[PDB]
Amino acid sequence: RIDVLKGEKALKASGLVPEHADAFKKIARELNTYILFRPVNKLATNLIKSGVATKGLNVHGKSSDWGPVAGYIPFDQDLSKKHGQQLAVEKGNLENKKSITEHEGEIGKIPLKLDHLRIEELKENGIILKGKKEIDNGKKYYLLESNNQVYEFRISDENNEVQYKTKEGKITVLGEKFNWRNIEVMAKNVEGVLKPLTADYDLFALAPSLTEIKKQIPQKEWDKVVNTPNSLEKQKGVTNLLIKYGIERKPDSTKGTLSNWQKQMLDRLNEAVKYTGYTGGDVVNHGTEQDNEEFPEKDNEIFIINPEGEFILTKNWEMTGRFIEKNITGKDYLYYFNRSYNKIAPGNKAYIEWTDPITKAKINTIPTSAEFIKNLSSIRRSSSVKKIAGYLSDYYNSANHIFSQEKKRKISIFRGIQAYNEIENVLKSKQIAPEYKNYFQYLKERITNQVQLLLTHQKFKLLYKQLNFTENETDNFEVFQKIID
Amino acid sequence: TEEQIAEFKEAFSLFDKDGDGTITTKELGTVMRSLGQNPTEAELQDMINEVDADGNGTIDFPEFLTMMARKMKDTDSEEEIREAFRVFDKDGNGYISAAELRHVMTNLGEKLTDEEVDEMIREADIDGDGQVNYEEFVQMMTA
Ligand SMILES: [Ca+2]
Ligand SMILES: [Ca+2]
16 A cells, blocks of 8 residues: 545645546546646646646746746746746746747747736735735836735736836845836737746656557558567567557657657647637647656656546655556556656756666676676776677577577576686786776676576586686586586 | 767777777677677678778778767667566566566467467577566567
8 A cells, every 4th residue: 555645635736727637537548548747836727727828848937836926937037936046047037038039929928917816816825915005107006915025016907917126125036126017927929919828737657558559550560570480570570569659759849759649648638628618729738757858857746647537646756656666567558767767867967766677687687798898988987808798798699599498597607607707807907997896896796696596597606616717618618517417 | 979989989999909999890890799789791891891991991990980870870779678678577577577478468469378478588588597688688679
């Protein structure tokens, strides 16, 4: 058992519009695929529902979660949820700045207008309170209070335009000060007019059942494979079909990197909400978070919709990983996790961890020749036997599929000790690179486990005595054969 | 990537009895293989003739680097392969077992017999552990 929210409570924490999530229950069930979302600004929900246009990848400024501009994407990112974080505000502002120019005509900015209703939705949420009146240069304004201490807001009586100014004695994160001025929000073009943007729905992941992916493969490309005499070329050809129609992803103009089944899922999803009434257009605008490799975010709570149409919400990352382990990557569904995980993402230097089964095994499996070299490459940052890089290429020789398992284990337990020998006398030389020395004491450890593993499969230090390293050929391999007996 | 190049240039120092990083086409195949590639004798020839029309047969880094600077275009799919392995490995032990292979198969429409299954495992298996680790899955998919 694992502590996760369900139904109503979970939907509540998700941020999605209720009607919308229901429409999503449908698609989950139909396509038998798990739909996982990323947190949605809770102050964005009513805006989304009222049909405010959401935002694409062409807009990276964050949305606000406080003040009169809650829910929208403020031009001035110090009014956003990243308020106070000088470095973030800056990348935010640079992002908006770019959006306004690198897409001139498509994305712009306009004054915030809080209608009579939003003011009250905000009054409810206890975000802002409509204050006392005030007049300036012949115009009527009503203050808007907030527990914010850097800024002060007021709204216009005529056009309902909200403005803001810094407070006496206070300084912006960017160390500024100014007097009265409209609050601008990121807008998009829609039939020649500028319409305000709000958060969108970001898919964290999508996990479709293998069967569901099959329907993506052409019933002819498959038969051709399935119908191959040689199995060794059968598997590969099947795996390549899986890669091609389910795994592989490609960069798209505005939907970022996604596969084709994802593009359809995307379309389906937007269709679903359009049918309920959402008139803002698309509510999902791009691929999933598992393909966001440069700047990978990491949320505490993911909102899940399983093929049953049941709402789940993980409480924390570790939990998110267990839910995916026990109901997805473990129950016949297609899943791939972000390639940046377990590494230092290049963009934001993020270091998000995830459970990788290939690594847990690494300890007992000896390395391929490339891994050996590639590990001398990257190892060659903090800074002449090629026999080992050959032996390792020998251990994993495809021309083994013509021998019996017994034969296989034999020759491999040998080819191993072989490289375990070369590595041995290399460490017997000079400790050239103090820590290069570790990589080998390590390989040696791996080589040891692998071998001592292949032996127990049939019948280490022990047998590592009655063997040759002298001169050379099919003389050592000889004494060996007998030792096993 | 700096490593992309770092790796190639890394292997170059393992088999040159020249010292000037100018190996022959005799070892060109020796390098391309110890570096995870299995070229055919025909390919090692038609290539080392166009680019290396020098008339010496000695290949250095700039030459070798530029050659590899082509192959690693579509083959780099390693990523998808590694992701594929993980799809099969339903229990996350790091190895692909026959049972698991059965699942991926029976779900993709190809109903298989426990006979044929254990047959596929033994095909791809290379050290006879009765299972397929990523390294093997890689050969079986590249090789
Ligand atoms: Ca397994
Ligand atoms: Ca094996």
